[PDB]
C-alpha cells in the first residue's frame, strides 16, 4: 500500500492537492421557487459527483480497494461528502449556505429542517475555527468510514493514519494533549450529524423522485437507488 507510508505532513499535501474545484450554478438572479432551486442543486450535485469520484481516487488508500468496494463507499458517502463540502464553503457566511459562489441562500428562500441542520453544522465549524487541513481529513474519513460496515482491515489502517494526522495537526497549533483529545472527539462527533443530514436528505430526494417534478439526473438516480436496495 502507498497510503500507510505517508508522513502526516505528506498526507495533508496529498489531500490538499486532491481537493475538487468549486462548481457554479446556473442560477439567474433575474428569475426568482422550491422546484427551481432543487433543479439547480440537482444539476450542481450531478456535476460535482464527477469531480468527487475523481477526487476519491486521489484519497490515499482508496485506489487500493476492489472496484466493488470503491463503488460501495461512494454510494454510501456521496451526499455526506457533498454536504460537508457545502458547510465548509459556507462557514464564513453566517446564516447562509453557499451551494455555489453564485448561489448563496438563507433559510427563508422538511426542506427547512435540512437547511437549518446544514446551517447549524456550518455554524459549529465556525465556532471551532475548523482548518482546511482538518477539513480535508474529515471528508476523507467519511468516504472510508460511512460504508465500511454495510480489505476491511486495510481500511482501518488508513483511518488510523488519518487520525494520526489530525492529532499531528492539533499538536502543531499549540494544543495541549487534553485539548487535542477533545477537539478530535468534537470533530468526529459532528460526523454523526453529517450522517443524519445525509439520511434525511436521501429520504427527501427519494420522495422528490416519486413526485416526478424535479427530474434527477441519471447518476443521481443510480446513487439514490443504491440507498433503497
Amino acid at each position: 500500500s502507498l497510503a500507510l507510508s505517508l508522513t502526516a505532513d505528506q498526507m495533508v499535501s496529498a489531500l490538499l492537492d486532491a481537493e475538487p474545484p468549486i462548481l457554479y450554478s446556473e442560477y439567474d438572479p433575474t428569475r426568482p421557487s422550491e422546484a427551481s432551486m432543487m433543479g439547480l442543486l440537482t444539476n450542481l450535485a450531478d456535476r460535482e459527483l464527477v469531480h468527487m469520484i475523481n477526487w476519491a481516487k486521489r484519497v490515499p488508500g482508496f485506489v487500493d480497494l476492489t472496484l466493488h468496494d470503491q463503488v460501495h463507499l461512494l454510494e454510501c458517502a456521496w451526499l455526506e461528502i457533498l454536504m460537508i463540502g457545502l458547510v465548509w464553503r459556507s462557514m464564513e457566511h453566517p446564516g447562509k449556505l453557499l451551494f455555489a459562489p453564485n448561489l448563496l441562500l438563507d433559510r427563508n428562500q422538511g426542506m427547512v429542517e435540512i437547511f437549518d441542520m446544514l446551517l447549524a453544522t456550518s455554524s459549529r465549524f465556525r465556532m471551532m475555527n475548523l482548518q482546511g487541513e482538518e477539513f480535508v481529513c474529515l471528508k476523507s474519513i467519511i468516504l472510508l468510514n460511512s460504508g465500511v460496515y454495510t480489505e476491511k482491515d486495510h481500511i482501518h489502517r488508513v483511518l488510523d493514519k488519518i487520525t494520526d494526522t489530525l492529532i499531528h495537526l492539533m499538536a502543531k497549533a499549540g494544543l495541549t494533549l487534553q485539548q487535542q483529545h477533545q477537539r478530535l472527539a468534537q470533530l468526529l462527533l459532528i460526523l454523526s450529524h453529517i450522517r443524519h443530514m445525509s439520511n434525511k436528505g436521501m429520504e427527501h430526494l427519494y420522495s422528490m423522485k416519486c413526485k416526478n417534478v424535479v427530474p434527477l439526473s441519471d447518476l443521481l438516480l443510480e446513487m439514490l437507488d443504491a440507498h433503497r436496495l
Binding site: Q70, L74, L219
Partner: peptide, 9 residues
Amino acid sequence: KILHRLLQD
C-alpha cells in the same frame, strides 16, 4: 452502472 464505469476509466 454509471459510477462503475466512471471509477474504472
